[PDB]
Each structure stands twice: as C-alpha cells, then as structure tokens.
C-alpha cells in the first residue's frame, strides 16, 4: 500500500507472486497444518526444479503453464485475512476515521475540553506552513529532465527539511480510532 | 528488490514524523476538562401501568366492540356463573 507499483513486473516478481498465491491456496485446500507443511514442501520442490532456466522463453512458457494450472486448481473460496481486501472486517473501521482537518470547525467550547492537544496541533500546523514552500521547491528542482517520472518521492536532502508531501502520509487516521 | 537508499531514508524520516505525531495524540492527565432497587419497577412498571389501565378501563372498555374475546370453553359438567345452569353430563361409553 505504501509503495507505488512499477510500470511493469519482472519475471522474478511474477514468479514470486504466483508462488505466494499457490502456497496460500494450497493452505486453503489442506486445512491442517501438518498436511499444509508437507504439500508446501512439495510445491517448493516443484518451484526449485526449474529455478535454473536460461531460456527466457521456456521460462515464460513454464510460467504460463503454471498460471493455467493455478487457475484450474485454485480454491473456489480461498482464505482471506480479515483486514485484507475481500475479507470480513476489511473496511470495517472507515466510519470512525475522521480526517484531521475536521477539528478546524470545533466550537471554542469543544476545544476548551482539550487545551494541550490543540496547543500541540498549532505547533504541527506551524511546522507544515514553514515546510511547504521548501518541499515544493525540492520537488520542482528534483523533477527529472526526461519525462520518465514515477510516484516515488525523494527524502529530505538538506537539514531541517521535512520529506516533500509528508502531511497526508503523516497525520493519517489511525487504523483503529 | 529492496529499498533503495532514498526509499530507506524517506521511510525513516516519515517514521520519525509519524511516531512523534502519534505521541502528540496522547491525552494529558487533565485533558478531558469537563466544565462544571424497586425504583425502576415503580417508575417504569407502575406509573405507566396506571396510565394504561386507566385508558383501557375508561376509554376502550366503554366503547362498543372495542375489546372482544373469544367465548370461554364450556365442558359437560360445568356451572355457568351468570345463569347458574349446570351443563348436563356426557353419554356413557365403553
């Protein structure tokens, strides 16, 4: 989630993703731990048998055959982690994830119930205000000449500089508010 | 694979900022500065019952056909209170 995808995946990445998915679905098929360990060792043996294949065409052919086999033998109802996409309780707590800027509209009566929190919040907002110009300048100067761009962002290069475009990455609502 | 040095450094800086922010989220000891048994049975199961019984007995029981009940079961050998009739017993069988 934190990292952005690349323009493409390499053969190694595709094979690793297939390996992870195959092992997860194999775990779904073999409910029990010992059986899962046995069959997972067998599956890794199958993967390792072709770990050395310098014919990058017979490698793609093997990968495509493996993907066909996976789509043939996949668990119809695999196991999804409760918090992962498609799993029960995925976006369960998105109702309570109120963004930070909502506190701007609090009545003074409501802010009087948290004197210290808003004192610190003013310091945070002042920090953001100070940093913004320098961070936008850093991005503008970091922009590559050639148009080949990426969503990856630079770290803070000078001192006393926050990483560019940090405010939303920070201050994001907690997972369990 | 693996984080490039720029990714690692940016992750470290964002980690520091995020952890400081989460720490600032802590409430202080004084923070929520708030500004200056038959009781249930009598309150909820007696006063409303007075009101309901009054309404029934003096607005629903006085109107025609407002409360209608199925006839009580009469068996051979019973005495009717109002008319005093005694229902004749049943025929004898093997």
């Amino acid at each position: 989630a934190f990292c952005a995808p690349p323009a493409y995946l390499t053969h190694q990445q595709k094979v690793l993703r297939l390996y992870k998915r195959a092992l997860r679905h194999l775990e779904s098929w073999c409910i029990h731990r010992d059986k899962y360990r046995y069959f997972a060792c067998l599956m890794r043996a199958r993967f390792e048998e072709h770990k050395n294949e310098k014919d990058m065409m017979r490698a793609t052919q093997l990968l495509r055959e493996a993907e066909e086999e996976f789509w043939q033998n996949q668990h119809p109802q695999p196991y999804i982690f409760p918090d992962s996409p498609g799993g029960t309780s995925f976006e369960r707590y998105e109702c309570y994830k109120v963004p930070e800027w909502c506190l701007d509209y609090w009545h003074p009566s409501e802010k009087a119930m948290y004197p210290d929190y808003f004192s610190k919040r003013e310091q945070w907002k002042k920090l953001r205000m100070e940093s913004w110009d320098r961070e936008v300048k850093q991005l503008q100067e970091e922009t590559s000449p050639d148009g080949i761009m990426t969503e990856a962002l630079p770290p803070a290069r000078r001192e006393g500089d926050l990483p560019p475009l940090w405010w939303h990455i920070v201050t994001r609502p907690r997972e369990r508010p | 694979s693996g984080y490039t040095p720029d990714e690692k450094l940016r992750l470290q800086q964002l980690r520091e900022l995020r952890r400081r922010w989460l720490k600032d989220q802590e409430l202080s000891p004084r923070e929520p500065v708030l500004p200056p048994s038959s009781l249930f049975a009598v309150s909820h199961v007696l006063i409303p019952m007075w009101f309901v019984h009054y309404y029934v007995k003096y607005h629903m029981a006085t109107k025609p056909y407002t409360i209608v009940s199925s006839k009580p079961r009469i068996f051979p050998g019973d005495t009717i209170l109002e008319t005093g009739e005694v229902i004749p017993p049943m025929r004898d069988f093997p």
Binding site: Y96, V98, P99, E100, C102, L103, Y105, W106, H107, S109, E110, Y114, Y117, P173, R174, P177 | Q25, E26, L27, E31
Partner: peptide, 12 residues
C-alpha cells in the same frame, strides 16, 4: 494510555 479520538463538530 488514552488517545485523542478525532470527531466532527457535533456542537452545532
């Protein structure tokens, strides 16, 4: 131990 919970302004 007790974290501030961000809420909308319900005062109004």
């Amino acid at each position: 131990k007790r974290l501030f919970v961000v809420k909308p302004s319900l005062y109004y």
